[PDB]
Amino acid sequence: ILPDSVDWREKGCVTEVKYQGSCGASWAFSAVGALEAQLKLKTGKLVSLSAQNLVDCSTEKYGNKGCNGGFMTTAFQYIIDNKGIDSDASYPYKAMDQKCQYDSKYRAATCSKYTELPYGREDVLKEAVANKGPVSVGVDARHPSFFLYRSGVYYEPSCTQNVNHGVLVVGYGDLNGKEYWLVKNSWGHNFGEEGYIRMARNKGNHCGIASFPSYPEILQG
Ligand SMILES: CS(=O)(=O)N1CCc2c(c(-c3ccc(Cl)c(C#Cc4cccc(CNCc5ccccc5)c4)c3)nn2CCCN2CCOCC2)C1
């Protein structure tokens, strides 16, 4: 039924790794990354979407607090309600809270719907990654080992299933008997493997990778 390995970068569905800096905007980068892939699949164009638009505009009404944190689910609902999100090129990332400056002239995507997956189900997450595209997730990143990660399949014995950092699952695989999730972070290219981390998969929802998964869709019409 499902492929043993997936890597959506190979289909040209994933934009360059971004750098969040001192603004706690991982939630926004995680949401735009998932939508960028659906935009590519639908239109054939790969376009970075504006994380800053989410930080500045998907705020208290959506239970978000910009650089202090937020949620991918309500970021998607903002895009739905707003009938768009701007390109990153038109509305670039400044790592600061700003006045909402959404301009529909520069709309680069819409969102038709989003779907939340069941907590802790790594099987369901695997299916969504294979059959839908990259999936927005949270992870527990409050361990020095995460910040210091350079390469390999990451396993942190003190990790919890409680999440605090948004990332994007762009694939999965197995390196000689160690299964992993292929994860895009937003701490620049100097983090991990060119901005990516391979995180232990089917090890009991390691670091809460499958705790709160969601993905958007852009439908024909
Ligand atoms: C602990 S937990 O794991 O048990 N869990 C408690 C329940 C929970 C968590 C996450 C979640 C999923 C994915 C991510 Cl990436 C994050 C995150 C994060 C993050 C990223 C950067 C910075 C901070 C710092 N935080 C401060 C803050 C204050 C105010 C708002 C936001 C952030 C947090 C959280 N989803 N759900 C369920 C949805 C809750 N609802 C969201 C609203 O309306 C609809 C319902 C966390």
Distance CA 125, CA 14 (A): 18
Distance CA 46, CA 31 (A): 15
Residues in Cβ contact with 209 at an 8 Å cutoff, skipping those fewer than 6 apart: 122, 125, 137, 139, 169, 181, 183, 199, 201
**Rg from Cα positions in the chain:** 16
Two structure tokens written together for 150: 């350079």
Q: Delimit the domains of the chain by residue range.
A: 1-221
Strand stretches in 46-201, DSSP E: 85-86, 107-109, 113-116, 135-139, 153-154, 165-175, 178-184, 196-200
Best of 60, 68, 71, 185 for a ligand 1 pocket test (most atoms within 8 Å of beta carbon): 71
Architecture of domain 1-221: Alpha-Beta Complex (3.90)
**Which residue type is seen at 214?**
S
| Residue among 63, 31, 55, 59 at smallest CA distance from 138 | 31
| Residue among 219, 32, 44 at smallest CA distance from 136 | 32
Dihedral sign for Cα atoms in the order 64, 67, 68, 70:
positive
Bridge pairing between strands 85-86 and 107-109: antiparallel
Structure-solving method:
X-ray
Distance CA 142, CA 153 (A): 17
Which atom of ligand 1 is found nearest the CA of 30? 15
Strand pairing partners for 182?
A: 171, 198
Gap from CA of 164 to ligand 1 centroid (Å): 6
Distance CA 94, CA 78 (A): 20
Gap from CA of 22 to ligand 1 centroid (Å): 18
